[PDB]
C-alpha cells in the first residue's frame, strides 16, 4: 500500500526528519533493518572516523518541500505479509 501524502509530511520549505542509506558495502539481505551509521570507503585509501575524499556519511536527507513536483512528493507506504503454516491461523474474519 502506498499513498501520496505531502499535506501531512512536507513541512513547508522542507522536511528533514526522513533519512535513508545510500552507501553500504553489501546488498541488503531480505527483511533486515540496519540502523547503525558509520563511514564508508571508496576503493583504496580508506577512512576511519574521518570525512572527505573516499569518505561519506551514509544517511542522506529528503528535502520534502510542498513546492516540489509530483515525482518528488512523499509517499506513506505500508506493507503486509501473510503466510500459511501448520499453526492455527489466528487472524481472519469468519471463524464460525
Amino acid at each position: 500500500i502506498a499513498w501520496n501524502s505531502n499535506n501531512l509530511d512536507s513541512k513547508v520549505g522542507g522536511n528533514y526528519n526522513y533519512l535513508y542509506r545510500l552507501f553500504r558495502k553489501s546488498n541488503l539481505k531480505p527483511f533486515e533493518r540496519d540502523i547503525s551509521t558509520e563511514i564508508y570507503q571508496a576503493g583504496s585509501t580508506p577512512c576511519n572516523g574521518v570525512e572527505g575524499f573516499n569518505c561519506y556519511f551514509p544517511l542522506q536527507s529528503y528535502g520534502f518541500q510542498p513546492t516540489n513536483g509530483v515525482g518528488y512528493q512523499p509517499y506513506r507506504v505500508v506493507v503486509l505479509s501473510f503466510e500459511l503454516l501448520h499453526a492455527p491461523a489466528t487472524v481472519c474474519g469468519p471463524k464460525k
Epitope: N7, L8, K11, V12, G13, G14, Y16, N17, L19, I35, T37, E51, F57, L59, S61
Partner: antibody
Framework: QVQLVQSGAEVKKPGASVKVSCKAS????????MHWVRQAPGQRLEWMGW????????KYSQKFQGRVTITRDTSASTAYMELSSLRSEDTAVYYC???????????????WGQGTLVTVSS | DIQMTQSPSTLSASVGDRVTITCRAS??????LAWYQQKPGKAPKLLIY???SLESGVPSRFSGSGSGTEFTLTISSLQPDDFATYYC?????????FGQGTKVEIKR
C-alpha cells in the same frame, strides 16, 4: 538522564563576534539533534537553528541568514556556535537543546541547557 | 509564516481547580504543536507534544486536545507546581514561532 551544560555569562560589544558552546551527555549518539534557540529578555523566544550532530548538516533561520554559524566537535561531542556582527537588540539568553535520542530527528526541544547570558553593550 | 496568538493573555485560578488554555493559529495546522511550561528565572519544560501526547515524567493532570486550528490545554487539579507561564509552539511549517505567554496567579 541526558544532560546539557554550556559556558557562562559573557559581555560583548557592537561589531564584535561571539562564540557560545555546550557539551552534551548522551547515552546514544544516534544523529543527535543539537538545536539552538534564543530568548530576548522576557519577550518572545525566537529560534536559532539546528546543526546535524550526526554528520554535518547546518540548517539555519531566515532572520539570522548570513551571519550565524554553528558546528560541533565529535570526540568532545560538544556543539559550538558563532554569532556575528552583534548589535544592541542582540542582548539575550541563549539555549542549547534537542536530544531526540529515541528517534533520529524531531522539531521539538526536549533537553534544554540551563542557559547562557550575552550582553551587547558599548 | 505561521501565525501564532494565544488566549487569554493572563488568567486566574486557585489551588485545586481546572484552567483552560487556548492557542489560536491563523492558518491550518495538522496537530503540529507542543505545550511548554516556563518558571521565572528558568529553562523551559515540555509536557505536550503533537497536540495530544503526554510526554513521560509529568503529572497526569496535563492533557492536550484540539486539532485543526483551535488548540486547548487542560489540567484537572491545580498544584502550586503549576504556577508559571505556558507557551504553545507550532511545527507544521517553517520558521517556527511561539505564542504570547499565559500565566496563572494566586486568587483570593
Amino acid at each position: 538522564q541526558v544532560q546539557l551544560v554550556q559556558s557562562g555569562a559573557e559581555v560583548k560589544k557592537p561589531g564584535a563576534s561571539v562564540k557560545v558552546s555546550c557539551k552534551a551527555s548522551g547515552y546514544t549518539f544516534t544523529t543527535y539533534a543539537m538545536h539552538w534557540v534564543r530568548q530576548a529578555p522576557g519577550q518572545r523566544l525566537e529560534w536559532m537553528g539546528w546543526i546535524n550532530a550526526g554528520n554535518g548538516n547546518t540548517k539555519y533561520s531566515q532572520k539570522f541568514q548570513g551571519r550565524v554559524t554553528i558546528t560541533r566537535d565529535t570526540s568532545a561531542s560538544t556543539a559550538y556556535m558563532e554569532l556575528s556582527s552583534l548589535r544592541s537588540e542582540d542582548t539575550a539568553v541563549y539555549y542549547c537543546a534537542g536530544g531526540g535520542g529515541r528517534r533520529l530527528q524531531f522539531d521539538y526541544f526536549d533537553y534544554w541547557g540551563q542557559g547562557t547570558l550575552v550582553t551587547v553593550s558599548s | 509564516d505561521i501565525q501564532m496568538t494565544q488566549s487569554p493573555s493572563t488568567l486566574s485560578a486557585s489551588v485545586g481547580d481546572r484552567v483552560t488554555i487556548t492557542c489560536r493559529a491563523s492558518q491550518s495546522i495538522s496537530s503540529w504543536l507542543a505545550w511548554y511550561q516556563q518558571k521565572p528565572g528558568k529553562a523551559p519544560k515540555l509536557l505536550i507534544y503533537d497536540a495530544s501526547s503526554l510526554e513521560s515524567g509529568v503529572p497526569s493532570r496535563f492533557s492536550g486536545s484540539g486539532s485543526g486550528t483551535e488548540f486547548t490545554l487542560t489540567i484537572s487539579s491545580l498544584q502550586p507546581d503549576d504556577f508559571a507561564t505556558y507557551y504553545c509552539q507550532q511545527y507544521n511549517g517553517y520558521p517556527w514561532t511561539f505564542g504570547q505567554g499565559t500565566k496563572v496567579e494566586i486568587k483570593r
